Amino acid sequence: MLRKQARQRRDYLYRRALLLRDAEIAEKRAKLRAALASGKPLDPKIANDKELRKDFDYDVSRDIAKEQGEIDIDDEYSELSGIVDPRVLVTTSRDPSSRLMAFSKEIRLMFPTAIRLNRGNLILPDLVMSAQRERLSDIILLHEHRGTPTAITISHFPHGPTLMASLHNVVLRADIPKSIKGTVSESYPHLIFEGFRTPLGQRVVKILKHLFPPRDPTNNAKSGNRVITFVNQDDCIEVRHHVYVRTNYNSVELSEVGPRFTMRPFSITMGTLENKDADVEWHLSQYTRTGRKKNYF
Amino acid sequence: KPKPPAPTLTVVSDVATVAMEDAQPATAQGVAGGETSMIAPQEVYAPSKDTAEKGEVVTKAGIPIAKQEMSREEKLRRRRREKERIRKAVQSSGAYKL
Amino acid sequence: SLLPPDNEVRRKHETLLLDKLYDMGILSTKAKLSAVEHNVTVSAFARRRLPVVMTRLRMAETVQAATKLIEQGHVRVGVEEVRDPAFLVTRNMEDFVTWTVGSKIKQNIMKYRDKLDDF
Amino acid sequence: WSVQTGQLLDRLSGHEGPVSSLAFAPDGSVLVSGSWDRTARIWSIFSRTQTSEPLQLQSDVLDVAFRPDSKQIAISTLDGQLTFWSVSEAQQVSGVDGRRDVSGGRRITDRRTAANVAGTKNFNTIRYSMDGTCLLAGGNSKYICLYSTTTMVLLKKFTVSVNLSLSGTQEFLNSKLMTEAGPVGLLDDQGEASDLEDRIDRSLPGSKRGDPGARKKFPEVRVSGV
RNA sequence: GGCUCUGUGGGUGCUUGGCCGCUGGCCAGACCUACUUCAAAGCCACCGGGGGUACCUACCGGUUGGGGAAGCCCUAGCGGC
RNA sequence: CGCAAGGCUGAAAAAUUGACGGAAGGGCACCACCAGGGGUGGAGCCUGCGCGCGCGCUACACUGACAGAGCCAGCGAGUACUCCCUUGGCCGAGAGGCCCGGGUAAACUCUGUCGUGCUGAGGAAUCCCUAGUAAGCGCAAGUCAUCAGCUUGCGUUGAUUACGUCCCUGCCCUUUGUACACACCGCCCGUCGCUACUACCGAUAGAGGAAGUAGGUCUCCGUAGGUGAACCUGCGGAG
């Protein structure tokens, strides 16, 4: 099994590098197809390449399929997108506190298909090993400061990305009394994402919305009574968890049911939780000059 | 990896299973076997709305009941059950004043 | 290629052909038909053979030594011992080619690593 | 999957390798899987808790069989050994090391002595008796073994074929058939055929599992099912 | 006395003779070269992919000059259609 | 540069598909039952959140103290790491450097010496937990966010009790679909909307109000015609 995970990760990295070179060529091939249909004259370096024309005659059709959106990009999520229900386990750090364990339970209840695991004495490579051995889609690690959580680590499996984020303004479910709160409904939640516009924003949108099981698309625009909101300002994604009734065709009553975060991501690594030496995709550039001026996501 | 599954339909007849059997001097089945007609009674005849009469309806039980003999309460309840399945899937001054 | 470019059966059989060749390990990408133009190659089949793929997996040192070892019969692919040095190892059986049960080559590797368990 | 529903119930998981043998218990309560992670699993599916008790073995699992009175199970590994486990308290109660009892070999295209050929020294398939007292075991070899499950002895060994047109039916080939160009049953003699459809070799290079070309000259002896 | 190397014979599949121009002969061989009525039925027959086609070849349709099997007819001929 | 760029104005629907339920039957859950375990809450310290609240940390004795003997880990190596500040004196024209004072485990195992002695294990509640899990123990690191009032790893020792059931509390879903054989089941229920039609009521042909329903082949012969020997067609007869 382990040889298959290593081999498939190496094949994925090689295919991504080949896609970089092929994109450098296919930016030139899309000018030849647009000039053929519209008749505007093109560059001589493009029109006088015999290899480009000879291979263009075979590779028209994938460019047309990408224009129509009929195919999907080579990704770690596009293999099993809406086919499998993504199972995900939430774990603490090594010796958790009682409020960290209740918070772990609360963000377990945020996902309708998640499970929680007691860490105890569990070495982190064997944690990764057991996740790949039970075909989990995601793990989420939690770190507390002193009864208040300060970091999440959302890792996608078998070889997918980590998003490590630091938590702020955490208002737990376990602070309000049982007369006012209650047992959270476990229905498949709607999701809304607000303010993600860069390709890095669509990356974090993908690795956050593939944590939830896929919604049945027959009548999802009106059915379902539970929503989860990820909205970012100043690249600190703030998340709420509401439950709603549609009290009229023009009005809706919301009710806050879950914990509130404003998590800020500081590391997105193309590689799982065990790989400390995985190649990062983005990291929070503090101690640079304009790293506080520039806004990502 | 085998192939993507593409739909293929097979036309079976109403002959007995000893017509699907291979060629040999006598059958392997007994005398009771050999009358099984290779399509079930549900494929010989199934009562449904597309093969019902004009005045009558067929219920979920497969029983013809007519709309004339059906009462108002049962008509209302059958309408409610079908609707439940569907849900699961310048003038004059006198005219102004007076 | 000679089919028109917006054709449904052209697109479906392009994806089928590229997925079949990438699953057999001949092509290294599954997103270009020019790979089947000038990258599918009898050398690509011949390097998907067994002694070259275990040379790459470093089961042997050279393809000559690998052909000698799989003629003497130390190498199984999966669960069955392989005596034919032309057995084309696909991309998901390159994860299952390994030594046989009572192999002297396996005892040599364990004796080098000082893990020679005689049980 | 479910038979009366038709759609997929579950994907059970916990194996670190491809799963080679499956067996549902004849009373109906326990699935047992056996896989090349050197492991077996007592899956309990039908209870309200769905649980998996592992049985750690010494090599890759090749076959799994139940006793008819379901308290016992025999799993045959790649070392060539049969291990008789209990299913209630998951402990091995019995075992046979059966390499020598099934090792009969030396095919053509085999440069080892028949005693040193590994690959024909395991039991690919095993079945209990309908009594439940004797296993029957057969692999990729000439011999079928019939073991006793209580006294752990080989009651009787059989030879499947005397046919020398098959390849692995005698463990000591004679040196009369070895020319200076390899064995005599190895030279390609298709060219001395009167008919073209017999002369044409439409065979694929390196195809162990079937090709429609299928030269198939001197096929091996193997018992693929008992 | 021991290791190694090499050679011959038997065995490594159920035991019916050596040879020939073989119903008979021979193992020391013998005789040497005859006899003849009417050439033949057709088909298939594996070169890696895309492309060129001036020349050669294959297939198909024709053109000049000769050739006449066979079919048809009758004024009968060295005939005629 | 042109259009956008002129205020019956003055803040707080759709529906033959819709709105809300009920009853029955399933599935699941340490936010449920059942059996146990462990926190917090009592005293002190303090980060944090808004004097209060918890989260950690410490003290609180049989599981004792003292002295010996023996025996066990894993992660950890950037010419890099250091706990203060000072009384004196050395060599110091001066700035400093010296010297001397003051403030690779824990655990475990075995053998002896003494014996409960301000020398006291946390209420109501509330929360969490089902196997290398709870709990004890130390060692190491400090990785662009968080974290020294701590964080995260890493090894060591390692149990009790459930592992059943939807009875309580709930959550999800069936009563439409999504496949066909065996086999089984057999029209779930209510309050309204919308649409179509029908008639009613009363003010000025008309917008409203209120309601209901949904059977002669073959051969021959005699004929008559055709293109004549023959031969063809049609008919009438016999075999």
Q: Are strands A114-116 and B56-58 parallel, antiparallel or unpaired?
A: unpaired
Q: How far apart are CA A295 and CA A234, in angstroms?
A: 6
Residue A72 tokens, joined:
């999907």
Residue D137 tokens, joined:
């075991």
- Give the one of C28, C36, C91 whose C-beta lies nearest to A14's C-beta: C28
Q: How far apart are CA D63 and CA D57, in angstroms?
A: 13
Query: Minimal CA–CA distance to D50: which of D12, D8, D1?
Result: D12
Q: Residue A218, by phi and psi: left (phi above 0), alpha (psi -120 to 50) or beta?
A: alpha
Method of determination is cryo-EM
CB atoms within 10 A of CB D21: 19
Residue A55 tokens, joined:
């291979």
Residues for chain A: how many in total?
Answer: 297
Chains linked to D by 3 or more Cβ pairs within 8 Å: A, C
**C34·A7 Cβ contact <8 A:** no
> Under a CB-based contact definition with an 8 Å cutoff, are residues A276 and A267 in contact?
no
Q: How far apart are CA A286 and CA A288, in angstroms?
A: 5
Nearest nt to A101, CA vs C1'?
A: F128
Query: Minimal CA–CA distance to A62: which of C32, C25, B49?
Result: C32
Can the peptide bond before residue B4 be classed as cis, meaning omega within 30 degrees of 0? no
Q: How far is B1 from chain C (nearest CA, A)?
A: 8
Protein-covered nucleotides of chain E (CB closer than 7 Å) are 11-13, 44-46
Distance, CA of B12 to C1' of E50, in Å: 46
Nearest nt to D191, CA vs C1'?
A: E46
Fill in the DSSP letter of residue D221: P
**Interface B:D, ≥3 CB–CB pairs < 8 Å:** no
Q: How far apart are CA A276 and CA D17, in angstroms?
A: 26
Q: Residue A282, by phi and psi: left (phi above 0), alpha (psi -120 to 50) or beta?
A: beta
> Under a CB-based contact definition with an 8 Å cutoff, are residues A207 and A236 in contact?
no
User: Chain D within 8 Å of C82 (Cβ-Cβ)?
Assistant: yes
In three-state secondary structure terms, B64 is: strand
- List strand residue ranges (DSSP E) for D149-221, in order: 154-159, 178-179, 182-183
Q: How far apart are CA B33 and CA D141, in angstroms?
A: 41
Taking contacts as CB-CB distances below 8 angstroms, the residues of chain D near C80 are 119, 140, 208
Angle, nearest 10°, between helix axes A2-38 and A61-68?
A: 90
User: Chain D within 8 Å of A126 (Cβ-Cβ)?
Assistant: no
User: Chain A within 8 Å of C32 (Cβ-Cβ)?
Assistant: yes
Q: How many pairs of residues across B and C have Cβ atoms under 8 Å apart?
A: 5
In three-state secondary structure terms, D178 is: strand
Greatest alpha-carbon span in chain D: 69
**C86·D205 Cβ contact <8 A:** yes
> Under a CB-based contact definition with an 8 Å cutoff, are residues C80 and C89 in contact?
no
Q: How far is D4 from chain A (nearest CA, A)?
A: 22
Phi and psi angles of residue D98, each rounded to the nearest 5 degrees, phi first = -120, 45
Nearest nt to D190, CA vs C1'?
A: E46
Protein-covered nucleotides of chain F (CB closer than 7 Å) are 13-14, 17-20, 27-29, 31-32, 38-40, 47-48, 54-56, 126-137, 144-147, 149-158, 163-165, 169-173, 175-183, 186-193, 203-204, 213-214
Nearest nt to A109, CA vs C1'?
A: F31
Taking contacts as CB-CB distances below 8 angstroms, the residues of chain B near C15 are none
Chains linked to B by 3 or more Cβ pairs within 8 Å: C
CB atoms within 10 A of CB C119: 3
**At CA A261, angle to CA A258 and CA A262, rounded to 5?**
155
Radius of gyration of chain D from its Cα atoms, rounded to whole angstroms: 21
Q: How far apart are CA D45 and CA D14, in angstroms?
A: 14
Resolution in angstrom units: 7.0
Q: How far apart are CA A227 and CA A252, in angstroms?
A: 12
- Cβ within 8 Å of residue A90, ≥6 positions away: A104, A107, A108, A114, A115, A116, A117, A139, A140, A142
Instruction: Among all protein residues, pick the one whose CA is nearest to the C1' atom of F163.
Output: D49
